[PDB]
Every structure is written in C-alpha cells, then in structure tokens.
Design a protein around this ligand. Structure first.
Ligand SMILES: CCc1nc(C)ccc1OCC(=O)N1CCc2nc3n(c2[C@@H]1c1ccc(Cl)cc1F)CCCC3
Ligand SMILES: [Fe+3]
Length: 288
C-alpha cells in the first residue's frame, strides 16, 4: 500500500515537525549555553507554526547580523562571476523588496510573500532535519522548509549544517525563477507516496541539482546549487579547474553518493532548468 503523504498544503503540519533538532557534539556552538537556548527558541517557533500563520518575525542579535554580514560580503564578491544568470537576475529584487543587506537578515515571512507573488513558492520554518520523503513532499505544494537560526559566530564559514544564511542566499533567489520552481515542484510531485527506492533516487537527483548543481550558460559553467551558493570555499572550488564534472543524467546521477562533511567528489552539469526538468520527467516514468 501507498505510505501516508500530504494531499493539501496544510497536511505539511503533520510531518514538518518530525525532526532531528540541535543537541552535534563537535558543533561549534555545542558548549555555548546562550547559543543552545537560542537554538531552542528557533526550534520552538518552527514546532509551533501551523500553516496559515504568518511566519514569526525574529529580532536577530548584533552577533547574528555580523555573522550574516561576513558571509554575505564574501559571497557577493563571487556571485557575478560564479552564479547562473537566473540567480543574478533575482538577487537584486530580493535586496529591494526583502531587505537583503550586509547589515540586515531578511525575515522568512517577507521572503515567503515575495516568492508567493513570483512563483507561488512559500516558506515554512523548520526546526531541524526532516526525512527526504517529508522534505520532498513540501516541494509538491511549492513549500520550501527553511531553517531560521544562524550559524555560531565562532565560525562564520561553517556549512555542513544548513542555517538561514544558506536558505536565504542559496535557495531563495532560484525559487523566485519560474522554470526552477517548476523543476523543484516536479521532484516533490514525483516523490508523493513513492517507494523508498524512488524517494532515495529523487532525493539524490535533488541533491545534485537544487543543492550542488552546475549549469552551462553561453558555453561557460555557472553555479545554481544552493549548497555551493552559500559556501565561499566550495563555490570557488566548483568553478576551478580542479573539480570533476559530469553531465546531469538522472539514471546515472541518482547512484552518486551525497557528501556532507567535505566538498563533493563530483558535480553534475545541467544544460538548463528546462532540460533538467525534461530529463527528470523521462526518469520518473521508470521509477513508477
Ligand atoms: C531531499 C533532501 C534531503 N535529503 C536527504 C538524504 C536527507 C534529508 C533531506 O532533506 C532535509 C535535509 O536534511 N536537507 C535538505 C536541505 C539541505 N540543504 C543543505 N543540506 C540539506 C539537508 C541534507 C542533509 C543531508 C543530506 Cl545527505 C542531504 C541534504 F539535502 C545539507 C548541507 C548542504 C545544504
Ligand atoms: Fe539546502
């Protein structure tokens, strides 16, 4: 029989709270009590959120805003030569309408309203790590589960855990692009009630596009993966000559191991978002 899956956007209330929350022995904020309390604060906001709520606005601390500023300033030096054209198009809109600035962390609620207007995407705050199945299921309704906390200030370059900087600078600009939003939703739609194997394969295809994808644009390689776009060192590494790259090809790509504590071993290059979408459509037919 088919496993439980959401049939409407509010059904995400029943899975979006199935998470692994902070407390991570080697995490940089682990021995910091103020940080632990702060992470609990963010976790509770997510756990108590229900669909239809405005996303609680947060007053970020001076320390949090500086950490954001440090990350934001370095990445912006790189985007013009590293990010795909779609990302560059949308980022200035975010600055103008959502308050993206070195000295200000954008509110998820504002970003959510921006995306609802542009592509029908919306944000739901998430307390911690969701299963691949639950995470993908949100995409079926154009819902992106977003962490709201900030990485520990001791290491502004700590990326193996997604934080709000990753969400806001890595994912959001692409979710505001129609072709990309369609591509993402179709991964979610394919995952709904699918087999475990199918969910694994879709999650890996997602990983090597939405999180670590490269694309070829006017004969040059650019970056569209969120994980690269929020990671100063890997963003540089990926477009350097030292990285190994292969064509995006779902039946091959879905077998590749997804790495978290290190740079990827390989990056997959999609021709365009429209083409990646077509390739997934052919692929999803084979996994039922
Ligand atoms: C379909 C995405 C996903 N895949 C897996 C294997 C586990 C969970 C999951 O969704 C929730 C989740 O933990 N993640 C999705 C969002 C995300 N964005 C990033 N990350 C994640 C995170 C995630 C964790 C582990 C793995 Cl293997 C993949 C992930 F996408 C990790 C670090 C780079 C930036
Ligand atoms: Fe991500």
């Amino acid at each position: 029989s088919v496993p439980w899956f959401p049939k409407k956007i509010s059904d995400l209330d029943h899975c979006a709270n199935r998470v692994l929350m902070y407390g991570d022995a080697d995490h940089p904020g682990f021995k910091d009590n103020v940080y632990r309390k702060r992470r609990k604060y963010f976790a509770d906001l997510a756990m108590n959120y229900k669909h239809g709520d405005p996303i609680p606005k947060v007053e970020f601390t001076e320390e949090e805003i500086k950490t954001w500023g440090t990350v934001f300033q370095e990445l912006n030096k790189l985007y013009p030569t590293h990010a795909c054209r779609e990302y560059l198009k949308n980022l200035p809109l975010l600055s103008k309408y959502c308050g993206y600035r070195e000295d200000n962390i954008p509110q998820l609620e504002d970003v959510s309203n921006f995306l609802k207007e542009r592509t029908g995407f919306s944000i739901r705050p998430v307390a911690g790590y969701l299963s691949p199945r639950d995470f993908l299921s949100g995409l079926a309704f154009r819902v992106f589960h977003c962490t709201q906390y900030v990485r520990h200030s001791s290491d502004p370059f700590y990326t193996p855990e997604p934080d709000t900087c990753h969400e806001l600078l890595g994912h959001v600009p692409l979710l505001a692009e129609p072709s990309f939003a369609q591509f993402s939703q179709e991964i979610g739609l394919a995952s709904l009630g699918a087999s475990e194997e199918a969910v694994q394969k879709l999650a890996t295809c997602y990983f090597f596009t939405v999180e670590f994808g490269l694309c070829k644009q006017d004969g040059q390689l650019r970056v569209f993966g969120a994980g690269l776009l929020s990671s100063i060192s890997e963003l540089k590494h990926a477009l350097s000559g030292h990285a190994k790259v292969k064509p995006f090809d779902p039946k091959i790509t879905c077998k590749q191991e997804c790495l978290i504590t290190t740079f990827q071993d390989v990056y997959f290059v999609s021709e365009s978002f429209e083409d990646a979408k077509e390739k997934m459509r052919e692929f999803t037919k084979t996994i039922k």
